């Protein structure tokens, strides 16, 4: 998960990465609009330096939603599962 891409012009995150926290994960308590990313995920393309391409989880919705909780768990496969609870 990549951090929020801060805009060098205003030194603040862009409108798309505005709801993301320092760790790139959207924090509860804020409102989510249409076409906004929740997890700035980036995965490698090889499977010499790894080449990561971004595949963020965008929110498709006509109306706004509020993040209530963001649970983060780790499975036996070292896989991180992140669940965001949107409320309307």
């Amino acid at each position: 998960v990549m951090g929020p891409m801060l805009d060098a012009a205003t030194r603040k995150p862009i409108w798309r990465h505005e709801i993301l926290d320092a760790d790139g994960i959207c924090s509860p308590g804020e409102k989510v609009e249409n076409k906004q990313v929740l997890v700035n995920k980036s995965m490698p393309t090889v499977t010499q330096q790894p080449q990561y391409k971004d595949v963020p989880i965008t929110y498709k919705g006509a109306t706004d939603s509020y993040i209530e909780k963001v649970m983060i768990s780790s499975n036996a496969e070292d896989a991180f599962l992140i669940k965001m609870l949107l409320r309307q």
Binding site: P28, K69, F80
Partner: protein
């Protein structure tokens, strides 16, 4: 940057970096929530 999280049962503020085994001290529960933001959010009473 110190990233803080809360446990599912202990409810204690734990600080962990990236790429670490999700665990909480004095227990073994593997449910970690994120604290609520500190930014100002406006709500409508309608």
């Amino acid at each position: 940057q110190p990233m803080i999280y809360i446990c599912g049962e202990c409810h204690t503020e734990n600080e962990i970096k990236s790429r670490d085994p999700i665990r909480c001290r004095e227990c073994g529960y593997r449910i970690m929530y994120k604290k609520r933001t500190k930014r100002l959010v406006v709500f409508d009473a309608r």
